[PDB]
Design a protein around this ligand. Structure first.
Ligand code: NA
Length: 193
């Protein structure tokens, strides 16, 4: 019935040099990487309010997106693009910095609460209040939250984050080549077992 459960992948972030390489852009790093690995450059597309791209993985189209809305307005980019290609929220995967998980940890999740990430709040809202999109939770720790989330991670910590990016990317490839379940199993065991 559904040979492709994930058709859109989004990476939340804030644009511009005053936010470059900050913790709150983790989601974007995952989109950047996955796109780099499939030789696609992202282009700004005004109608979708962000950097877009189409990736061919396992000979299926996976569309990617990094909004330029500013984080708390991410919903409008996501909705513009999903409405264009009639993509259900349930078919969307949103990578985002997650405070509730430590640096170096990544987890998938479907549905549920935003955990205070207003980016998620606004995404939920702009998808007709539907929570049931998938998430890729990139762990960034707790500590001052405004300062932390919009801060750069110290270098030892950054390599913890990059490892987690790397894993997330592997698990997204797996999701596309081998299915959702196999990717969910792999990430669930990550750092856990
Ligand atoms: Na960045």
């Amino acid at each position: 019935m559904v040979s492709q459960p994930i058709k859109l992948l989004v990476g939340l972030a804030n644009p511009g040099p005053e936010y470059a390489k900050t913790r709150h852009n983790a989601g974007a790093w995952v989109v950047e990487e996955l796109a780099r690995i499939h030789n696609v450059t992202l282009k700004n597309e005004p109608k979708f309010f962000g950097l877009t791209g189409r990736l061919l993985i396992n000979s299926q189209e996976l569309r990617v997106l990094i909004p330029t809305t500013f984080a708390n307005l991410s919903g409008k980019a996501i909705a513009a693009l999903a409405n264009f290609y009639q993509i259900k929220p349930e078919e969307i995967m949103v990578a985002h910095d997650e405070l509730d998980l430590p640096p170096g940890v990544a987890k998938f999740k479907q549905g549920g609460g935003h955990g205070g990430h207003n980016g998620l709040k606004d995404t939920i809202s702009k998808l007709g209040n539907n929570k049931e999109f998938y998430r890729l939770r990139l762990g960034i720790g707790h500590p001052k939250v405004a300062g932390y989330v919009l801060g750069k991670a110290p270098a030892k910590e950054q390599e913890c984050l990059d490892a987690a990016v790397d894993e997330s990317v592997r698990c997204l490839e797996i999701l596309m080549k081998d299915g959702l379940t196999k990717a969910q199993n792999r990430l669930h065991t990550f750092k856990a077992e």
